[PDB]
Structure 1
Amino acid sequence: REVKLLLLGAGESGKSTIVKQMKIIHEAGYSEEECKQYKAVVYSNTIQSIIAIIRAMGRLKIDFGDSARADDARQLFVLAMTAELAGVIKRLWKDSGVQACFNRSREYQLNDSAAYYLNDLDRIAQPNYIPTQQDVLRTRVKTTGIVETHFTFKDLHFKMFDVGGQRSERKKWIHCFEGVTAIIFCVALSDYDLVLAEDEEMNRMHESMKLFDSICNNKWFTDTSIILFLNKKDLFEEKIKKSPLTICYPEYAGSNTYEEAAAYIQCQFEDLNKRKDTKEIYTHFTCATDTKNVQFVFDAVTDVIIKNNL
């Protein structure tokens, strides 16, 4: 009864995180040793996030609230964990000019976990620091290529192939299109106001939509269960009152509130289906980093993968 499953989606939509949530759910969590291995990544994720904001300040021409931060900024660039760097990083983060820039992250490229790590510097910067399960989940590593991983859930064994979402990775996707039982297609809801990291002229949501039009309606998958994860709902929730959806959909007559705007995104993607009589997009709003939520969604998915394949 071996099932073949694909995680597809544009870059940073959250595929690799769902793969992590399998290791946690359907194996038995992360060890402590395994967590201590993600130190470097968390530290590097943190250092990269803050560099990102500061370089944006010179581009966007935003002043520090306090001019002595320039001197920390200098040190930051040169240093890239230790006490010196932590202090530097903290001081930068608390600065009001830095925060004005962070609140304009849509105009440049910033890791979504920035706020999470930077707001937790005190814990992270400790010498005897061991990442938590969530810290690990929050980590960002660009996936390059195609990673196959095997899994056994309650009623299914899964061959699960994780791929890279960037444009240069999409050539490679054709290697795992054969005999595909199900495709979980990730979309980062929080991308509606952002541009692509590999094209600054291209809105990330319009990118995911074109990508989805082509997978949803592809001849290869007439017999595959198309599952649509509307992901990063937590990030979207705290975005939407600050930045309007009209950035992404000029047509939009509805309120810039979480549920209605989320219902609207959903319909846009689901409207890309060209055979609605015969094909069903199974949609789920997910927070990839929230184990409990990904556990409940994966039960609902599995059921569809039995009902539609036996």
Structure 2
Amino acid sequence: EVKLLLLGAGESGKSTIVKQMKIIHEAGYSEEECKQYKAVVYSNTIQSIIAIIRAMGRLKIDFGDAARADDARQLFVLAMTAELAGVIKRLWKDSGVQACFNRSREYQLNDSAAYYLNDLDRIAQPNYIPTQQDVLRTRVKTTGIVETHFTFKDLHFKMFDVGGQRSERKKWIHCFEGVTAIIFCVALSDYDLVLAEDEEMNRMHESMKLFDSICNNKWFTDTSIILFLNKKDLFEEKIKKSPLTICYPEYAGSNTYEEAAAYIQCQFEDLNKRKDTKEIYTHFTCATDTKNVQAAAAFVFDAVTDV
């Protein structure tokens, strides 16, 4: 009876939200289901550390220890085993690798790269099983449309998740029929990144063009628009290191979590052309934090209840 549509750019966090609805209302991920994602965890860790040493060549950075070159060679051939763990750990500890990691803005690196790598000892053990946090931290591109059903207070939702990348936005239109509410996810940490499809397009700017399209859409003039400003935990960490001016030349405020976030929210709310007729319900979220998403869900519920 209630249709929920998750929209947003790629890496936005929409699929992580779906995962959280199963954790909260469907009592988590079974031990067996976690073992399913074990390969995904390993693939993500491997792809991340590969992405870093590959960046070094492009970025003119070399190891703090020249002996690592044999480990970097070993990483590619092996692409889990206890030898591969020792190789990755040494590469992650290297001063050169760490320098390149702190320049990840200049290439494409998974959000959860450091999360997995900093916990490699746990990840490398035998009989290791992905934790619920580990599963949420996994990245897998969403291809096609995925639906999910859950019931709350005698109201049950149809949640639709779709791919955010340009390759999949053609299929967004197929879902627009009968949408109660839209949850538009935006990565706060995307302000200094660039799209993986287009090397020179700013990720946040892309997210903006999308939100303008959706927020001021002809089909959705009825539907309530919810704006999820996601990845606030990464934004908090990141805003100290990188200035928000990279995304906005005009921004003269401080590079602080509270003030910078407030600014991004305002720029997205300003895209509403029917600003008097239509309201936008905005919430700051950490999609990997189940407790935080529980609070978000309640906020989503209140917006739908307002009907």
- Measured against the shorter chain, the TM-score band is over 0.9
Specify whether residues 10 and 93 from structure 1 end up closer, same or farther in structure 2 by C-alpha distance, changes over 3 A only: same
Does 2:258 align with 1:255? no
For residues 302 and 35 of structure 1, the distance between their equivalents in structure 2, rounded to whole angstroms, comes to 34
For residues 129 and 188 of structure 1, the distance between their equivalents in structure 2, rounded to whole angstroms, comes to 30
Q: CA-to-partner distance for each residue in 1:38-75, whole Å, 9 max, x for gaps?
A: 11000111101100111000011101110011110011
Q: Secondary structure at the match of 1:159?
A: strand
Q: CA-to-partner distance for each residue in 1:224-279, whole Å, 9 max, x for gaps?
A: 01000000000000000100000000100100010000000000010000011110
Does 2:131 align with 1:128? no
Further displaced range: 287-296 or 247-256: 287-296
Shift of 1:179: 1.2
Does 2:33 align with 1:34? yes
Shift of 1:96: 0.6
Specify whether residues 162 and 230 from structure 1 end up closer, same or farther in structure 2 by C-alpha distance, changes over 3 A only: same
Name segments (4+ residues, structure 1) moved above 3 Å: 296-304
For residues 290 and 271 of structure 1, the distance between their equivalents in structure 2, rounded to whole angstroms, comes to 28
Q: Secondary structure at the match of 2:199?
A: strand
For residues 234 and 26 of structure 1, the distance between their equivalents in structure 2, rounded to whole angstroms, comes to 24
Does 2:76 align with 1:77? yes
Specify whether residues 301 and 290 from structure 1 end up closer, same or farther in structure 2 by C-alpha distance, changes over 3 A only: farther
Specify whether residues 301 and 246 from structure 1 end up closer, same or farther in structure 2 by C-alpha distance, changes over 3 A only: farther
Equivalent positions of 1:198-213 (< 5 A) are: 198-213=197-212
Q: CA-to-partner distance for each residue in 1:94-149, whole Å, 9 max, x for gaps?
A: 00100000000001000000110000001010011011110011111111111112
For the Cα contact (< 8 Å) 2:181–2:304, is it kept in 1?
no
Q: Residue 269 of structure 2 aligns with which residue? A: 270
Aligned length: 303
For the Cα contact (< 8 Å) 1:56–1:101, is it kept in 2?
yes
For residues 126 and 265 of structure 2, the distance between their equivalents in structure 1, rounded to whole angstroms, comes to 44
Shift of 1:299: 6.0
Shift of 1:152: 1.2
For residues 282 and 133 of structure 2, the distance between their equivalents in structure 1, rounded to whole angstroms, comes to 25
TM-score, structure 2 as length reference: 0.96
For the Cα contact (< 8 Å) 1:72–1:88, is it kept in 2?
yes
Specify whether residues 35 and 99 from structure 1 end up closer, same or farther in structure 2 by C-alpha distance, changes over 3 A only: same
For residues 154 and 30 of structure 1, the distance between their equivalents in structure 2, rounded to whole angstroms, comes to 22
Shift of 1:160: 1.1
For the Cα contact (< 8 Å) 2:202–2:247, is it kept in 1?
yes
Q: Secondary structure at the match of 1:195?
A: coil
CA RMSD, 1 decimal: 1.2
Q: Residue 284 of structure 1 aligns with which residue? A: 283
For the Cα contact (< 8 Å) 2:180–2:304, is it kept in 1?
no
Shift of 1:303: 5.9
For residues 256 and 188 of structure 2, the distance between their equivalents in structure 1, rounded to whole angstroms, comes to 13
Specify whether residues 286 and 240 from structure 1 end up closer, same or farther in structure 2 by C-alpha distance, changes over 3 A only: same
Does 2:302 align with 1:303? no
Identity of aligned residues (%): 100
Shift of 1:187: 0.2
Q: Residue 214 of structure 2 aligns with which residue? A: 215
Shift of 1:154: 2.7
For residues 249 and 28 of structure 1, the distance between their equivalents in structure 2, rounded to whole angstroms, comes to 42
Structure 2: tracts of 5 or more residues without a match: none
Specify whether residues 38 and 298 from structure 1 end up closer, same or farther in structure 2 by C-alpha distance, changes over 3 A only: farther
Q: Residue 144 of structure 1 aligns with which residue? A: 143
For residues 86 and 302 of structure 1, the distance between their equivalents in structure 2, rounded to whole angstroms, comes to 50
Q: Secondary structure at the match of 1:199?
A: coil
For residues 52 and 201 of structure 2, the distance between their equivalents in structure 1, rounded to whole angstroms, comes to 21
Specify whether residues 303 and 114 from structure 1 end up closer, same or farther in structure 2 by C-alpha distance, changes over 3 A only: farther
TM-score, structure 1 as length reference: 0.96
Specify whether residues 3 and 58 from structure 1 end up closer, same or farther in structure 2 by C-alpha distance, changes over 3 A only: same
For residues 105 and 156 of structure 2, the distance between their equivalents in structure 1, rounded to whole angstroms, comes to 40
For residues 18 and 303 of structure 2, the distance between their equivalents in structure 1, rounded to whole angstroms, comes to 17
Shift of 1:298: 5.6
Structure 1: tracts of 5 or more residues without a match: 305-310
Q: CA-to-partner distance for each residue in 1:143-178, whole Å, 9 max, x for gaps?
A: 111111222123421111100000110001010001
Q: Secondary structure at the match of 2:275?
A: coil
Equivalent positions of 1:89-238 (< 5 A) are: 89-238=88-237
For residues 303 and 136 of structure 1, the distance between their equivalents in structure 2, rounded to whole angstroms, comes to 33
Specify whether residues 180 and 29 from structure 1 end up closer, same or farther in structure 2 by C-alpha distance, changes over 3 A only: same
For the Cα contact (< 8 Å) 1:286–1:297, is it kept in 2?
no
Specify whether residues 98 and 151 from structure 1 end up closer, same or farther in structure 2 by C-alpha distance, changes over 3 A only: same
